[PDB]
């Protein structure tokens, strides 16, 4: 089956950068692609990063396409994300989720960013 739950915790002033990440055991993460993300304070939602198929497809919210990382950590149970460009008057919240087809239906706790200042 798979494992998994948002997490991490990071601040993101304008010009910051966070570090989240998606918990993850058996099924690892980018062995069977990962993506996630998708909320925030009445924001509305906010992906972040994530990693479809092998990895070929990735994300990165919706204004950093080269400014966000999806991070990953194998052996550690998660995989992290170095998004920085929000602007101290956006904080948001993410939640995980795969998608690549007998693996997507999962990811479901809530996370965020704190646009440090």
């Known amino acids: 089956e798979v494992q998994l739950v948002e997490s991490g915790g990071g601040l993101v002033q304008p010009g910051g950068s966070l570090r989240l990440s998606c918990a993850a055991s058996?099924?690892?993460?980018?062995?069977?692609?990962m993506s996630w993300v998708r909320q925030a304070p009445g924001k509305e939602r906010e992906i972040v990063s994530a990693?479809?198929?092998?990895?070929?497809?990735?994300y990165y919210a919706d204004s950093v396409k080269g400014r966000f990382t999806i991070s990953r950590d194998n052996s550690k149970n998660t995989l992290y994300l170095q998004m920085n460009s929000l602007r101290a008057e956006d904080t948001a919240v993410y939640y995980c989720?795969?998608?690549?087809?007998?693996?997507?239906?999962?990811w479901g706790q809530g996370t965020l960013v704190t646009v440090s200042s």
């Open positions: 989720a795969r998608l690549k087809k007998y693996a997507f239906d999962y």
């Open positions: 058996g099924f690892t993460f980018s062995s069977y692609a």
């Open positions: 990693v479809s198929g092998s990895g070929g497809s990735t």
